[PDB]
Structure formats: C-alpha cells, structure tokens
Design a protein around this ligand. Structure first.
Ligand code: HEM
Ligand code: HEM
Ligand SMILES: [Mg+2]
Lengths: 110, 110
C-alpha cells in the first residue's frame, strides 16, 4: 500500500517565514500517532508577495493522518495558533492556510 | 546547512497520472550525483479536470541540484520525454510543467 502525504500551506506576511519555521522545532505529539512517518517544513524561495511555508507530513495511510486530525495532541499543538483575522489574532503573521492531499506513487532513497 | 528541495509539477490529461508515475520506477543516473538524497513522486487527490503529478527531489544543497540539472545524466533521462505541445508529442499526456524551489527549514523522522 502506498504512502500518503498531507500538506498544510501557510500564506504568511512577507519576511515572516523564518520566525514561523522556528515554531516547528520541538514536537508536540504528532510522533505518537500510529502511522506517522516523517515531516518537512519548507520555505518557498523567490516569492515576491506573501511568504510561503509548507508543512509536509508523510504517513503509512490517509486513515493515520485522519486519526491525527481527530487526536487530542493535534488540538494541544494548535491551541495557541492564531490567524491574523482572528479576534485576538492581529499580531500573527499567518494569513491563511490550505491543505493539499497526495498519494505517494513512488519513493527512492540513495 | 539546510537540505534543499526542487519540485517539478506536471499537469496531465485526466486519467494519466498512474501510467506517468510508472515511468519513474527505473533510475537513469540521478543516484550518481553527489548530494542527491531522495525523491517522492505524488498524485494530487482532488476533483479537477486534469491530473497533477509532482516530482519532489531532496538534496544536501541547492548546488547539488544545480549540478544535476546541468549534467549529462539529466539529459539522458529526459531525451525521450515530450510535452503534448511538442512536434512529436502526440502520444504524451503531459500538458505542461513548472519548477518550484524550497529551503528545508526542519525535518523529523519517526
Ligand atoms: C488550521 C489551520 C492551521 C494553522 C494556521 C497551523 C499552523 C501551525 C503552527 C503555527 C504550528 C506550530 C505551533 C506552535 O507554535 O506551537 C503548527 C503545528 C503543526 N501543524 Fe499546523 N496549522 C494548522 C492546521 C494544520 C494542518 C491541517 C496540518 C496538516 C498537515 C498541520 C500540520 C502541522 C504539524 C505536523 C505541526 C507540528 C505538530 C506536532 O509537533 O505535534 N497543521 N501548525
Ligand atoms: C522539461 C520539463 C520536464 C518534464 C516534461 C519532465 C518529465 C519527466 C518524466 C516523464 C520522467 C520519467 C522518465 C522517462 O520517462 O524516461 C522524468 C525523469 C525525471 N525527472 Fe523530469 N521532467 C522535466 C524536467 C525535470 C526537472 C526540472 C526536474 C527537477 C525536479 C525533474 C525531475 C526528474 C527526476 C528526479 C527524474 C528521474 C531521474 C533519474 O532517475 O535519473 N524533471 N522527467
Ligand atoms: Mg523573501
């Protein structure tokens, strides 16, 4: 069975990618979900308007990822996360997010 | 130093994602490039009119990628690759591509 990838794309105020990425340094429970395999946090190069940060998560199945979304550790990790348009959100550089889902058809490691 | 990721995003005719991904099973030189680490080939899950396949390459540095992009082996792997729009591209389901580049700010492996 193929691996599954979920991407959370963050649209951010220009210049804020680096401080946003630093927030991902320490784990907050994702690693405890059966089926989680690994994660990458990327900054999109050569952007001219808003910054872009992608959070890529790789799982043994889509069910594993859904289990994480419904988990208590997901809620705990996101409790102090705010969008800029939230009532108490003005200081946040995070404008919006968009989730993308993928089937991993092939993988190769050197 | 951070890892680097290059993405080649293919727009494909509806239904051709699976046949296109099978073309990546066999290596054609990239494993010989110093700095190359791994690759994922993904199909986007959605309801669009076209299929979308992404080729994600992970490298020790942007230089490693640049070296590959300019190499004889890159040329070899792509010598029979055509777009639908190419003079001899009648058989190809590949409509277009776009390259994206990313700095990898963080990685975690279970
Ligand atoms: C709903 C809108 C979301 C926003 C604005 C957002 C943003 C953030 C931020 C800023 C962090 C770091 C939290 C901190 O500072 O402690 C975080 C955690 C994280 N987010 Fe999200 N997130 C959202 C939902 C999602 C979704 C849907 C995914 C699926 C890919 C995702 C993937 C991750 C991962 C893997 C972590 C680290 C979790 C851990 O270590 O346990 N997030 N998110
Ligand atoms: C000019 C536009 C491009 C098109 C239409 C295209 C399409 C393809 C296709 C269909 C294959 C399968 C091999 C075959 O059928 O012989 C392939 C090989 C491959 N492509 Fe591309 N590609 C392009 C440029 C790129 C770029 C810019 C990247 C950078 C990420 C890339 C990454 C790869 C990799 C990693 C392989 C396997 C290489 C190996 O095993 O040595 N391609 N390409
Ligand atoms: Mg910038």
């Amino acid at each position: 069975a193929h691996m599954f990838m979920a991407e959370n794309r963050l649209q951010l105020q220009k210049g804020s990618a680096e401080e946003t990425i630093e927030r991902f340094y320490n784990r907050q429970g994702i690693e405890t979900i059966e089926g989680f395999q690994q994660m990458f946090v990327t900054k999109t190069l050569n952007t001219e308007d808003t910054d872009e940060v992608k959070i890529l998560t790789i799982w043994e199945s889509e069910d594993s990822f859904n289990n994480w979304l419904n988990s208590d550790v997901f809620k705990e990790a996101h409790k102090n996360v705010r969008l800029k348009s939230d009532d108490d959100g003005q200081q946040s550089p995070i404008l919006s997010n968009k989730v993308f889902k993928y089937d991993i058809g092939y993988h190769y490691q050197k």
